[PDB]
Design a protein around this ligand. Structure first.
Ligand SMILES: [Mg+2]
Ligand SMILES: [Mg+2]
Ligand SMILES: [Mg+2]
Ligand SMILES: [Mg+2]
Ligand SMILES: [Mg+2]
Lengths: 152, 107, 49, 65
RNA sequence: CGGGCGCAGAUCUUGGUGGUAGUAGCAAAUAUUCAAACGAGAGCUUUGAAGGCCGAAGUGGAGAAGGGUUCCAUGUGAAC
């Protein structure tokens, strides 16, 4: 509902949305930037390899403290991790977008991820217990995810 | 053929060398499972419970130095799993390990 | 404690019957004005005194 | 399923600890239908629930010493 | 004509949001492992087997004070 970057041709495009998803926003934004411009089948093979840690997700922006890996050189980057949580939620949304292209009547084998963004959702409220009788906020960072897939 | 069964001698002593006392027996089964994947080129290794008793026979830290093991590659026959085959790993009680070669068994 | 007075047990009986959530048909009555029972207490996080 | 009610009911029927209650792994679906002490007693009479024997604490060495 | 009439500051008030930061951290009391079951989903549930610990000044079995339904069965798996 009210996507950003409305498609160039809405007839050859399928959309998928997700709100209040309990993935980490920083881990998901880096995962979403990895699958952008990939085919629907290449994005699935890439995300399925991140879960089994066969290729990494390069952490470009939120890279403070993340470690280095040998798989990061594939992306001309030094830092990379394997956000299994972010790979599964994005894999569940690619499955929904592929099923939306079927209901619309699109060639699913020709889909390419045109637009994909991850917003910040309202943070969830939990608390941790610190020293000297203090309570600090233990806040979740959920995310809104949307994506546009087009034919090529 | 596809369905095959051989007997191996896993030198567990050199695979758990340098492991803490509380992890020598759990690491041995992870090395036995890795051994079955390496030799029998099939994931989804199923370790017989009698073999779990054999590795844990002398506690968590005193693992037997070697283990006579029979690797039986079978078909899953369910088609619910992606792996068509699986390696059923059993225990072979032997009196001595001297001269035990890798041999195939009959069906 | 197992040893209770009749006044304490009668007091705990009232609080035990108020710790019930609102009926579902209440939200259809007041136009979703009362969304939940804001007086729900848990036996750990809030004591009775 | 979760055989926690049957593990508890059998320990009170057999008058043993929960560490001595043996539930048949092959008949886990049959024991799961037992929701009362009377049905547990029937499973014991059928041999599906047995009291495991006490771990041996032989006094042979001390009696030898 | 009448004002509770103009803010950047007051370790201002209230509310909201950042960088730090996917960071510190989730390191006291020896221990888990195999298989199976249910299940969309299992290192963590259950069952069995194995190997361990508490070792009767128990990590055991029952009370007092205090708690007040936390007891028990079933269901759910949003939130915690
Ligand atoms: Mg305090
Ligand atoms: Mg308290
Ligand atoms: Mg003023
Ligand atoms: Mg101001
Ligand atoms: Mg009740």
């Amino acid at each position: 509902v009210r996507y950003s970057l409305d498609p160039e041709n809405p007839t050859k495009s399928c959309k998928s949305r997700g709100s209040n998803l309990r993935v980490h926003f920083k881990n998901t934004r880096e995962t979403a930037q990895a699958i952008k411009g990939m085919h629907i089948r290449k994005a699935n093979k890439y995300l399925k390899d991140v879960i089994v840690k066969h290729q990494c997700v390069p952490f470009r922006r939120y890279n403070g403290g993340v470690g280095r890996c040998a798989q990061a050189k594939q992306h001309d980057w030094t830092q990379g991790r394997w956000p299994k949580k972010s790979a599964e939620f994005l894999l569940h949304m690619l499955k929904n977008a592929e099923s939306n292209a079927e209901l619309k009547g699109l060639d699913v084998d020709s889909l390419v991820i045109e637009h994909i963004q991850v917003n910040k959702a309202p943070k969830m409220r939990r608390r941790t217990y610190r020293a000297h009788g203090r309570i600090n906020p233990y806040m979740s960072s959920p995310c809104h995810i949307e994506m546009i897939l087009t034919e090529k | 053929n596809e369905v095959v069964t051989r007997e191996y001698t896993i030198n567990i002593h050199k695979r758990i060398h340098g492991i803490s006392f509380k992890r020598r027996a759990p690491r041995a089964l992870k090395e036995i499972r890795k051994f079955a994947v390496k030799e029998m080129g099939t994931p989804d290794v199923r370790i017989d419970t009698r073999l779990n008793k054999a590795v844990w026979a002398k506690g968590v830290r005193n693992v037997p130095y070697r283990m006579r093991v029979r690797l039986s590659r079978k078909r899953n026959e369910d088609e619910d799993s992606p792996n068509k085959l699986y390696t059923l790993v059993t225990y072979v009680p032997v009196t001595t390990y001297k001269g035990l070669q890798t041999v195939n068994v009959d069906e | 404690a197992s040893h209770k007075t009749f006044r304490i047990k009668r007091f705990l009986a009232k609080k035990q019957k108020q710790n019930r959530p609102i009926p579902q048909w209440i939200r259809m009555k007041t136009g979703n004005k009362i969304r939940y029972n804001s007086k729900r207490r848990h036996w750990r996080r809030t004591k009775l005194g | 399923s979760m055989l926690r009610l049957q593990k508890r009911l059998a320990s009170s029927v057999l008058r043993c600890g929960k560490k001595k209650v043996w539930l048949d792994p092959n008949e886990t679906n049959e024991i799961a239908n037992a929701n009362s002490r009377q049905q547990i007693r029937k499973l014991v009479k059928d041999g599906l629930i047995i009291k495991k024997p006490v771990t041996v604490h032989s006094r042979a060495r001390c009696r030898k010493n």
